[PDB]
Structure 1
Amino acid sequence: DGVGSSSGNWHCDSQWLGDRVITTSTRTWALPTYNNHLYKQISNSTSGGSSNDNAYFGYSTPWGYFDFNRFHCHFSPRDWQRLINNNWGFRPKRLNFKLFNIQVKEVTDNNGVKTIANNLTSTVQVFTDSDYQLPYVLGSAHEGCLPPFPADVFMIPQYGYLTLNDGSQAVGRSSFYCLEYFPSQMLRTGNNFQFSYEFENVPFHSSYAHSQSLDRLMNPLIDQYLYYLSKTINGSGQNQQTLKFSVAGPSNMAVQGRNYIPGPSYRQQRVSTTVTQNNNSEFAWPGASSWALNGRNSLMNPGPAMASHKEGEDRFFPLSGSLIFGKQGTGRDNVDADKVMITNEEEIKTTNPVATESYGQVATNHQSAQAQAQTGWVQNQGILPGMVWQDRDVYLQGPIWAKIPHTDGNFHPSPLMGGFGMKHPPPQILIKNTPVPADPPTAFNKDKLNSFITQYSTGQVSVEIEWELQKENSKRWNPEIQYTSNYYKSNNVEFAVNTEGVYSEPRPIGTRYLTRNL
């Protein structure tokens, strides 16, 4: 429309209907100029990369993108508490995105003094990739998200992708995507962008624990009509052999028969938060569970969802099998254990095996009069018909969704890190501010113009998601566990701003408090 009329209002509210939530958010963003309007073929050989497992090849683009898919973007700590205390499950339904109130600024730096001026005729060009024809970055949980606190202004991250490689060289199947080669919408100040998206049907994330375990499904009062082999030995002494059977019953459980078995396991190494209980050596990389693909060892981060620890022992956690979050202002490298936030997976102890323990035990050999019965340990168990498991839990800081890779087959395509796997997730929104060149020379030259005006843009994003809720039906008598702010006095308020104006989330908040029967 025009320069003096606003493109859109700030709408941050969230409305709770019965079966449905609609959470609107609005932020202020700032978009710089990336790579000086170039595509630079990034590879490991540019800097270091002396290990084959770290080899990569790809391209970096001047474009930048919006990643809103962490949970803290769309939920306040109170709207999250209201969510997870009152509801068994949820899932997204619709998505609506808006760009408005765009402003483009010119910067002139001369004699070290710099003047920022406003370009009314400049454009910024933005498109959504609806057909998934570009490498999908978002589902990888990289930084650059809409800040959790609505008053922050955030930079838009740079877009770039990786392709096939042999070492640092490019293999003939490598693809190159020119992002200028897509239809986009060019926006001046007084233009606004929007689009709508409908999530494909995804199973409700289960926010509950289980009020009974998998190995106790039974009436403790009554016997089973099925037997087991209780006694293989008549008595002590030679040639004493007999087969005695016994009714499996409350006196001896864990020998009863049962219809279902716990989920699969891939063992992780156990490491204790107490320092002295750990070994003295470097076991971090060497002693870690990995998966190798095409000669590259990819360390196995968050694998099959598994209980992090057993019973009341919290001292230890799986090496790579847990999510680790940083606190506010946490360093980049060699951070002490107190500044990281380690996540606790113990809610699934009922249906899932412990991550650091063997799935079970199997017989190695056939016994005989000569040969003793020998049993080995099962470190990993892929699946068995009749297994039952649960997915890894959802947090405020964790990702909302991921993209299920397009492939011939996949089993239970729920993201190993967390969230809602989708064949067609909400599309990427890429944004770039169009180049404005400096004065061309008078005489014509074949070469392309490498001199541009230093420039950046600013605006607001509105992202509203419509969520579908599954209400608690529980007939339980005694009171539930809930998520609370502990009342004791403190220098600061949790999930509130600091004295310097810094917003910090004290602890990771899981989704699982309410319980259901197994």
Structure 2
Amino acid sequence: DGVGSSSGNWHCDSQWLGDRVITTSTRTWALPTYNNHLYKQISNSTSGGSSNDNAYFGYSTPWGYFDFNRFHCHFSPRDWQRLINNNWGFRPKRLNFKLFNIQVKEVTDNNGVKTIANNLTSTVQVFTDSDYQLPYVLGSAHEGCLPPFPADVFMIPQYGYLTLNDGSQAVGRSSFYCLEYFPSQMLRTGNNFQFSYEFENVPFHSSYAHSQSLDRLMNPLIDQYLYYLSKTINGSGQNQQTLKFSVAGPSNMAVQGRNYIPGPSYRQQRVSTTVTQNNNSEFAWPGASSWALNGRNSLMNPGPAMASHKEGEDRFFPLSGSLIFGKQGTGRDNVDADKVMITNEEEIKTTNPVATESYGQVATNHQSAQAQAQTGWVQNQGILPGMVWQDRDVYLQGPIWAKIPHTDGNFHPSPLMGGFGMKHPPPQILIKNTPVPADPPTAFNKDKLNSFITQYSTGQVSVEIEWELQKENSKRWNPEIQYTSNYYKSNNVEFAVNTEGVYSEPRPIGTRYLTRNL
């Protein structure tokens, strides 16, 4: 429109209908100039990397991008509490995104002092990768998302991508992408940008915990009509071999026939938070479970959805089997256990195997009069018919969605870090300040200009997402477990600001508090 007219209003609210909840969040953003308007080839050689497992090749772009792939970007703690305490499931339906109130500033430095002024004629470029023609980086748990607290002003992260690499070198199959080779809208201070997105059909997330275990689905009062081999010898010596059979009933539930079995496994090492119970050696990387791709080892992290620990074993965790969040103010490198928040998936112990245990035991020979029957620990077990399992729970500060890789085949493409897997997720939204050259020389020079006016941009961003709800219809008589704040007095209110205005999330919040039968 014009310089003196706002191009949008501040929309931040949650609307709770019967089967739907609409979340709207608005944030103020700041966008600097990245790479001084240049594309730069990057690799482990440029960053000084040495290990083969961490070698990479890619490019850093002068473009930024908007990321809102975390639940706290849309749900307040109270809204999250309502969702998790009142619904058996939820899923995103549609998306509305807006950029408005664009403000481009120029910075001039004379001598140790910088002056900031408006540049009303400068432009900012925005476009969406609706055709998914660029590498998708929103599927990784990267920082730079919209802040959970609406009053926080955030910096737009720089967009970068990786391609095929051989050490620090590239190959002929490696791809280079120029983001200026895409049509993009150019916005001055009076212009705004908006688009709508429809989520593809995804299953409802399981925001419930099973009230039954897979091995306890039988009637505890009635025998089965099936038999089991109870004895093989002749009880109370030589030549004592005689078959025996008994009815599988309530007294021996472990041997009853069952139609379904727990889901797959890939065993993790077990770590205690009581440090003196751990071995006196360096076992992080060495002791960890991993997978290999083209000679590179990548940590199995977080891996298959598996129960974090056995009942009562709360002190133990799988070495890389769980999402680890950092508390407010936590450092980047080598922080103590009290500075991080270790999530756990104990709710899925009713259907999923324990991460630090074998799947089970399997026969490994043919027993005879000369050879005793032998069994072997199944340390990893693939998908088998009749298996059932629960996916990893999602969290308030955890990811929402991920892009399913474009491959010939996949199985249960639920993101392993939690969330909704989609072939066509919300498109990447890329933003960049248009370069403004400084005064050029009065004589023609064919070289590209390298002198630009120092600029940055700021504005507001709004994203509205409609969520579909799956209401609970339980006939359970006793009250359910519910997420609740603790009344006991404390220096600060949980999920609030401190005396210095710092917002903090004191604990990870899952979604599985209500219960339903298996």
TM-score (norm. length: structure 2): 1.00
CA–CA distance in 2 between the matches of 1:165 and 1:344? Answer: 35
Deviation of 1:113 after TM superposition, in Å, equals 1.0
The equivalent residue for 1:170 is 170
Structure 1: 5+ residue stretches without partners: none
Q: Which moved more, 1:351-360 or 1:229-238?
A: 229-238
1:119 aligns with 2:119: yes
Q: Which position in structure 2 is the counterpart of 1:462?
A: 462
Provide the rounded CA distance (Å) in 2 between the counterparts of 1:18 and 1:80. Answer: 16
**Deviation per residue, 1:243-267 (Å, 9 max, x gap):** 1100000111100000000000000
CA positional deviation for 1:436: 0.3
Q: What is the CA distance between 1:236 and its match in structure 2?
A: 3.8
Deviation per CA, 1:458-504, whole angstroms, max 9, x where unpaired? 11001000000000101100000000001100000000000000000
Q: Distance in 2 between matches of 1:407 and 1:125?
A: 32
CA distance in 2, matches of 1:65, 1:451: 25
Once residues 47 and 440 of structure 1 are traced to their aligned partners in structure 2, the CA distance between those partners, rounded to angstroms, is: 34
Mapping for residues 93-492 of structure 1, pairs under 5 Å? 93-492=93-492
- Separation in structure 2 between the aligned mates of residue 493 and residue 310 of structure 1, nearest angstrom: 33
Equivalent pairs: percent with the same residue? 100
Within 1, Cα distance between the matches of 2:114 and 2:271?
Answer: 53
How far is the alpha carbon of 1:292 from its aligned partner? 0.5
The CA deviation string for residues 7-60 of structure 1, in whole angstroms up to 9 with x for no partner, is: 011010110000001000000000000000111101000122111001000000
Give, in angstroms, the shift of residue 344 of structure 1: 1.4
1:368, distance to aligned residue in structure 2 (A):
1.1
Compute the displacement of 1:233 (Å). Answer: 1.1
1:212-255 deviation digits (Å, cap 9, x = unpaired): 10000010000000000000111242101111100000111100
Aligned residues, how many? 518
Moved over 6 A (4+): none
Query: Quick check: 1:66–1:157 contact (8 Å CA) kept in 2?
Result: yes
After superposition, give the CA deviation of every residue in 1:56-111 in whole Å (9 maximum; x if it has no partner). Answer: 00000000000101000000000000100000000000000000000000000111
Residues 289-330 of structure 1 show CA distances to partners (whole Å, capped at 9, x for unaligned) of 000100001011011100000011111100000111000000
CA distance in 1, matches of 2:47, 2:429: 30
Contact 1:128-1:427 at 8 Å conserved across structures: yes
Matches within 5 A, 1:52-67: 52-67=52-67
Structure 2 stretches of 5 or more lacking a match?
A: none
- Asked whether the equivalents of residues 96 and 195 of structure 1 are also in contact (C-alpha less than 8 Å), the reply is yes
Could you tell me whether the CA contact under 8 Å between 1:268 and 1:355 is conserved in 2? yes
Cα offset, 1:369, TM superposition: 1.2
The 3-state SS of whatever aligns with 1:276 is helix
Offset of residue 184 of structure 1: 0.2
Q: Secondary structure at the match of 1:139?
A: coil
Alignment check: 8 A CA contact 1:235 1:241 kept = no
Q: Deviations over 1:179-226 (max 9, x none)?
A: 000000000011000000000000000100011100000100000000
* Kept after mapping to 2: 8 A contact 1:225/1:247: yes
CA distance in 1, matches of 2:313, 2:114: 59
CA distance in 1, matches of 2:251, 2:14: 54
Please say if residues 125 and 187 of structure 1, whose CA atoms lie closer than 8 Å, have aligned partners that are also in contact.
yes
What is the Cα deviation at residue 277 of structure 1?
0.2
Tell me the distance in 2 between the aligned counterparts of 1:337 and 1:209.
27
Alignment RMSD (CA, Å): 0.5
Q: Give distance in 1, aligned partners of 2:191 and 2:367.
A: 80
| Cα distance in 1, alignment partners of residues 476 and 302 from structure 2 | 33
Q: CA deviation at 1:383?
A: 1.1
Report if aligned partners of 1:202, 1:422 keep a CA contact under 8 Å in 2: yes
CA contact (8 A) 1:24 1:74 kept: yes
